[PDB]
């Protein structure tokens, strides 16, 4: 059968064609009815919308161009759109349209209706190890895919992981994703998830994604992250210390995996050794994982989100709504020419 190497080479050829010739301007605002805000962020909001012609529901991410410029996130936002329109993997959210107007940037994605992993995790407290493992396996495959394309993701957390109608993961928010063949230096990410080499202002590489997977698995299985404190500086001190405490309920296999992902020396960290991702896939904690079956989405999920029809948003918190205003003057046109 096809080898993993051949699979990934075909994925790269597919990605590169879209990476070098990105799609642009494939819809406009009055193609959609805006329904409800699904989530918010630094530069705008994500809204449930209905496409008028098809009746399909989508999730429309709206970014205020002037705010992006002010917070010095122009290149990151160009990264986000250029990468998201070029990737294709079962656990990555599908971009359907993108466009811009005088005031805003718009990325219209497939609507993932089961809510954030964050919401479910906080509510239930913690996931069982089989439950955490099912989600972790999807992240492992997704990072295998992204890294083979020279992409670093850099914003793994339950707030950016959505549950679909099958109970599988959809990764969203490519705001810090970047295509890089060497090391990179940007201080970005979420405090609890930062690898030590980010904090220490070293160059860093895709090994920070495997560190963040360690944080995610720990948080999923424990119900709290391995390093937390009210002040981020105190979080950073714990991260660089090289000390992790584990709940007594963690299996010995889980602790061993986590010691190797939450390894402060990036040169000894799993995912960053000679065998790459296979040191993670072959680890005892994943011994029951059928990696091909996960990729094919044939495994029964630990739970299916409740759904009461199309356009149901009950798996999402409510947010204060704010009407879109589009200025009569084009803002920051040159900065976002390639969007």
């Amino acid at each position: 059968q096809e080898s993993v190497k051949e699979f990934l080479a075909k994925a790269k050829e597919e990605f590169l064609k879209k990476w070098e010739s990105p799609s642009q301007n494939t819809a406009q605002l009055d193609h959609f009815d805006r329904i409800k805000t699904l989530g918010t962020g630094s530069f705008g909001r994500v809204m449930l919308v209905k496409h008028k012609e098809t009746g399909n529901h989508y999730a429309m991410k709206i970014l205020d161009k002037q705010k992006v410029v002010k917070l010095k996130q122009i290149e990151h936002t160009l990264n986000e759109k250029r990468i998201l329109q070029a990737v294709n993997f079962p656990f990555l959210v599908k971009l359907e349209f993108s466009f811009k107007d005088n005031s805003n940037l718009y990325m219209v994605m497939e609507y993932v209706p089961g809510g954030e992993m964050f919401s479910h995790l906080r509510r239930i407290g913690r996931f069982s190890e089989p439950h955490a493992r099912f989600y972790a396996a999807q992240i492992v495959l997704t990072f295998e895919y992204l890294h083979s394309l020279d992409l670093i993701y850099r914003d793994l957390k339950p707030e950016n992981l959505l549950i679909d109608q099958q109970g599988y993961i959809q990764v969203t928010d490519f705001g810090f994703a970047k295509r890089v063949k060497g090391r990179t230096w940007t201080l970005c990410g979420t405090p609890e998830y930062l690898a030590p080499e980010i904090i220490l202002s070293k160059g860093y590489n895709k090994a920070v994604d495997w560190w963040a997977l360690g944080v995610l698995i720990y948080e999923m299985a424990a119900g709290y992250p391995p390093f937390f404190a009210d002040q981020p500086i105190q979080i950073y001190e714990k991260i660089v210390s090289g000390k992790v405490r584990f709940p007594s309920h963690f299996s010995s296999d889980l602790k061993d995996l986590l010691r190797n992902l939450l390894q402060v020396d990036l040169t000894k960290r799993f995912g960053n050794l000679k065998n790459g991702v296979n040191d993670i896939k072959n680890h005892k904690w994943f011994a029951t994982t059928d990696w091909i079956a996960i990729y094919q989405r044939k495994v029964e999920a630990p739970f299916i989100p409740k759904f009461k029809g199309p356009g149901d948003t009950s798996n999402f918190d409510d947010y204060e709504e704010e009407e879109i205003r589009v200025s009569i003057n084009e803002k920051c046109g040159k900065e976002f020419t390639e969007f």
Binding site: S42, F118, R122, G125, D155, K157, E159, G175, F176, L187, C188, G189, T190, P191, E192, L194, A222, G223, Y224, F228, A229, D230, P232, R245, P247
Partner: peptide
Amino acid sequence: TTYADFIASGRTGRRNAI
């Protein structure tokens, strides 16, 4: 317990980036 210390902390809601 560590769980109680987390739930009493200021970091249990949605977390912003740096």
